[PDB]
Swiss-Prot record:
SMART domains: Gal-bind_lectin, GLECT. Expressed abundantly in the bone marrow. Expressed exclusively by eosinophils and basophils. Not detected in monocytes and neutrophils. Expressed in CD25-positive regulatory T-cells (Treg) (at protein level). Found in intestinal tissue from patients with Celiac disease, expression is directly related to the histological grade of mucosal damage and to the number of eosinophils found in the duodenal lesion (at protein level). Found in sputum of patients with eosinophilic inflammatory diseases such as asthma (at protein level). PROSITE patterns: GALECTIN. This is Galectin-10. The record marks 135 as: Not glycosylated.
Amino acid sequence: SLLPVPYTEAASLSTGSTVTIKGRPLACFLNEPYLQVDFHTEMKEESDIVFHFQVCFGRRVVMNSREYGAWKQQVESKNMPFQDGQEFELSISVLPDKYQVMVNGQSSYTFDHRIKPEAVKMVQVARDISLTKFNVSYLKR
């Protein structure tokens, strides 16, 4: 739709920051579209990933970090608040100890910090969605 996917934006995060995403899957859930949001330590896409969030719509969610080139311990969830064929609003809040992921206003996933959020320099949104809104909040010290 409005914003090109894969979408890449330089970013800084600390406690109280929020990344908000509005979009829509490009396929019905039977065809298993994916959505990926990655918080990178550098602008280059091969850089380390502080927080990797990957949805297989209708099936499962996986979260992980990539540290010095190597994926760490995968966290898997079968929580699936996304709705087949619907636009979604996704919010990722930086809390003191974890990321909190809200889907359409409802807390749906969390992920404890493995690397300080201050290491993030870039956010990338990719895979099988159209993206109409992307915002990183920058209001707090």
